[PDB]
């Protein structure tokens, strides 16, 4: 038997049979390194949301951008509101960003041990609050 | 034998460093030129993206190529909306700028 | 006197209409070995003998007692138990594994697709095998250290969330780290071609740098570090 | 019977066994274009070979200057010359050709600066038939060795079209008319019952070390073939021979490697003095495995203890510079620290002399070939085959010398494959095989399934290994081998009392080692009875009341002027043992040595001598 034939068969015994698949998310032990993977996929997918609708409202939506600032400035614009819009739209993009490095770090094979890991890990936690800070008051 | 994977993943990571290039040379030079470079890389990093998100998730025949098939649409009107902004208005780096100072 | 509560996954196959369900078993840690697979064994020779486990050097070889243990994959004759009364150790069977029977998972497929690499030393000409040995300097075997110790208990593997979701088509880990150790090689001839049998968007490239193998690897091994390299490989080998 | 279903396979040739010697033998046969199977109730790698951790001897001459007939004698004199030097003389030849077949095959040997394998020095083995100091000709890799020979080995039996029998127990051989046909098995996924048959069968089940309470053994070495053999009528041989490995730790009693030794090794009491110097004055602890580990149980009984027990010795490593540690010893740096909490390159271990090896076994030919004992001559059962520990050609004899058995592997299920391939072919007669066969093994199975009884089979195994392990240890007298002989005897009366709660067909685990039981105790039962007969000490086995080697003649004098003792009065010579599955008796009888050698012009017969390291 060939190591194709194999796994055709395996599929075929377990599908066709009444053996539960073995809990996996619900059980499994979450860790920082881990935690912080599932963010970039999600800051990821948040912020080609962002562009997508922004680039679909310039072909589906009527007037200029200079006159869609108004329809902002017409709902009264509060101080500190306006300061957790910017960051609110900032975390995304800051974190993304900052741990994209750290992903381009480990793809030339640099800094991949656990002990680095959590060090890293916690530099982008500690960069992303502070960039995002920094650039939503400007 | 081709290597069609193998240069699909450069690909990402070449236009991942160009991204990381544009975001600190839009702020320092805005201009035209760098709305539709910060256009052309932008879109195409989140169509190659999404794409890895819909690769793993999307079990199925039908279903495969009928996501991918939508997230080329879907990208594409991406890309020529922010040509149409960056032609017909303010153009993204000036965009961002209005919707900063407010 | 020491008490210790042991929650364990259990289903029988045997059983009409059983599904999963965890039962809690009262140990008394004095008569007891120090590691989890020695209660799983005072369990099943004591108290009840319906508890089913893969088990054989207790040594932390073979690899037989892989399973998840407090969230972790490890093994039962390496991991030693939390002697912490007040907290109740949970014993689950490898993730994402189709259960044959309480903690013994369908292993077929990880072994089909190690077979499917071709984990053996290949020569462009076999016809003067059997009589020379081979020459390889001591730096060039160096390669091999913390690739070639790997065990196959596939703790790696089934905490990689890719290979849950796509366990059909995805090599995983441990699969992967061991092409890398034929790949760096020095004997082998066939590296290029080895290197070629990953080019696809499935077999190699759904590692997104997740590093649960690196961190549960009950050896220490470091299996992500070696798709990172089989990476940079595939992205520059010419021709 | 009509409430299991029975599938019928037809092959060229079954192994049974999936460790280093079984795959050896599996893919070789197919090698030789035989459709060929291999039952096993492990997953291959799972095979207790993977423990291995010293190495595997082949007097390659990487180190210094090497003679492959330095190692033959260096065996023969191990073996306490119970070895038959006609098998010795065939693996020590073969030695460098099947070392560098592994090598070639992709294994990770250690390297020399000439970039060859690596050897280093390990208990009992010598240049110059002795006269020429310590030998290196133990082949490693690194510490993990046996690890490397049975992935290296699974890794190379891909390439060839064998059907596994993964996670199968063989229950019986497929006798008819004293014949093998085959073996029935337990399919342990889904509890069916498969008769797989064929024209030759191999079996190379290993050891049967579970027969104690401590050993450096796994849980699942329960000498099953052993068993298969004996519940077929068949002899077994020198069973009474047990291996007690110097360096166990004293926990778990997991292996600490003789390779530390082989490294630079001291063994130590409490007084501080290195005790190995006065027991052996020139070899000192990198002798022989039977009497290192004499000398520490001997310094146990007077006192000098180690622990707060005071019953174990320690294994020194702080004097070795730590890089010779991290390359050379690194399996047992961690295992020490996981077991014993001993950081290696600071502290020193707590070892203790566990059983570890199994000489015994099912008497073989050099060719692999199963022999039966009729009319005092030796007779080949025809279509079966063993090799490994779970044989008997008695290459190791009385001792078995450091880093043989997985040399003994390689080659001799090398052997059983040409053995075959060179006295048929492939594509010939399966011998057909009757309706009703195997038809016990399955009702025996029946019974242990749904056993109702008052004794669980964990309290009935823990009973048997207590009681080889005080009866039968290290030193052992009349008396006290007797007491351990009727209470084994009544423990065999016991299985028929055994309790199983587990009533399923798919992986029953709670059935299977109550099958290994039965197993176990055929094997404990012919250890037992062969030691309390024998009146002599020789290699492993040593009486206190009969202190002496008795051999055919006084070898400590010359022999000339001397005369000839009877066959049936000394005791150089092989016992072979049975027993009547029923009342559990043990009958035994006996075998000669063979001396001569394969070829007295390229390899010259060593005669008996006073043997003292
Ligand atoms: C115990 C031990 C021995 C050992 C060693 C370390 C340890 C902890 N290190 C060694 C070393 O470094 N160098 C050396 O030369 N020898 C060393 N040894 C001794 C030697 O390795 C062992 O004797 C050897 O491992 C035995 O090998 P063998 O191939 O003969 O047997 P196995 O590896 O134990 O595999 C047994 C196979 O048989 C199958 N089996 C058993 N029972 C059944 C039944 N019921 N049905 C179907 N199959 C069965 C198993 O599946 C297994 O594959
Ligand atoms: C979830 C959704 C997220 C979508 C992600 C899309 C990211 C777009 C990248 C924009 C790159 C910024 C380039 C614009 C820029 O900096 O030039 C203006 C300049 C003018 O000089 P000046 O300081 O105004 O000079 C004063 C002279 N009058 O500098 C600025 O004022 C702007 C700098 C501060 C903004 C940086 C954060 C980027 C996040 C913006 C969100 C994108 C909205 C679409
Ligand atoms: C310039 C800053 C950025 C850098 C350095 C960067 C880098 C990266 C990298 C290296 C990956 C792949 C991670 C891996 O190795 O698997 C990734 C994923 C992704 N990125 Fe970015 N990125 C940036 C900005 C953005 C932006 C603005 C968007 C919005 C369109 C975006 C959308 C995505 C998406 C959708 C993914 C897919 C997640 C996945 O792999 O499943 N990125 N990014
Ligand atoms: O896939 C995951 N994120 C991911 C995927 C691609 C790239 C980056 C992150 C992930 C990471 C860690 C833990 C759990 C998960 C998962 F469960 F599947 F959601
Ligand atoms: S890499 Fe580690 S966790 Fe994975 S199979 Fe090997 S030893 Fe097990
Ligand atoms: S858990 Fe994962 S996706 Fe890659 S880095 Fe490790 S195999
Ligand atoms: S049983 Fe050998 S690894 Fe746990």
Known sequence: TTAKEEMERFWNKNLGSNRPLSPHITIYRWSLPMAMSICHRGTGIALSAGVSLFGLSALLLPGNFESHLELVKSLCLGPTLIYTAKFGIVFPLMYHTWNGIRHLIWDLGKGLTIPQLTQSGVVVLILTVLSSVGLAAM | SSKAASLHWTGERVVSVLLLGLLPAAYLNPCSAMDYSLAAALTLHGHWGIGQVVTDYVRGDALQKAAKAGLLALSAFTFAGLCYFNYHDVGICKAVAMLWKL | ?239 | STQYPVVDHEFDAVVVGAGGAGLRAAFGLSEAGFNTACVTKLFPTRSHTVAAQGGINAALGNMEEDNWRWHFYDTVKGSDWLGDQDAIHYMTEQAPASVVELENYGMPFSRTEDGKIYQRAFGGQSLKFGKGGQAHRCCCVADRTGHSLLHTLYGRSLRYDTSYFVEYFALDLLMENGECRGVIALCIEDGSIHRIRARNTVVATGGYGRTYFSCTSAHTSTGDGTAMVTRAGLPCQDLEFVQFHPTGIYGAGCLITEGCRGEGGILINSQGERFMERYAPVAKDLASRDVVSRSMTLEIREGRGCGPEKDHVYLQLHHLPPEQLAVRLPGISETAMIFAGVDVTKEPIPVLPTVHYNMGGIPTNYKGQVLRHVNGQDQVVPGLYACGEAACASVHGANRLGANSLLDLVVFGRACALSIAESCRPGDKVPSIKPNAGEESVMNLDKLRFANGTIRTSELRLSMQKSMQSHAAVFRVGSVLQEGCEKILRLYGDLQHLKTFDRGMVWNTDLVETLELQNLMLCALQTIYGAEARKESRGAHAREDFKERVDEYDYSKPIQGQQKKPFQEHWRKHTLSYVDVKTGKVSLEYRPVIDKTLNEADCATVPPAIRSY
């Not at chain 3, 209660?39 to 108290?47: G, H, P, V």
């Not at chain 3, 596939?154 to 796509?166: E, L």
């Not at chain 3, 020095?186 to 071609?193: A, G, L, M």
């Open chain 3, 1 to 239: 006197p020491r008490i210790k509560k042991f929650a364990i996954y259990r289903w029988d196959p045997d059983k009409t209409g059983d599904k999963p369900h965890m039962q809690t078993y009262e140990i008394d840690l004095n008569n007891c070995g120090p590691m989890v697979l020695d209660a799983l064994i005072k369990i099943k020779n004591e108290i009840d003998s319906t508890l089913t486990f893969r088990r054989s050097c207790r040594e932390g070889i073979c690899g037989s007692c892989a399973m998840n243990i407090n969230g972790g994959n490890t093994l039962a004759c390496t991991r030693r138990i939390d002697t912490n009364l007040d907290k109740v150790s949970k014993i689950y069977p490898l993730p994402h594994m189709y259960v044959i029977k309480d903690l013994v998972p369908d292993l077929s497929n990880f072994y089909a697709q190690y077979k499917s690499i071709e984990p053996y030393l290949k020569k462009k000409d076999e016809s003067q095998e059997g009589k020379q040995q081979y020459l390889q300097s001591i730096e060039e075997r160096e390669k091999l250290d913390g690739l070639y110790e790997c065990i196959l208990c596939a703790c790696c593997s089934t905490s990689c969330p890719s290979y849950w979701w796509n366990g059909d088509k995805y090599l995983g880990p441990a699969v992967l780290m061991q092409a890398y150790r034929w790949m760096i090689d020095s004997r082998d001839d066939f590296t290029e071609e080895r290197l070629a049998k990953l080019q696809d968007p499935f077999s190699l490239y759904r590692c997104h740098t997740i590093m649960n193998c690196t961190g549960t690897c009950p050896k220490g091994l470091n299996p992500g570090k070696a798709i990172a390299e089989i990476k940079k490989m595939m992205a520059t080998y010419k021709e």
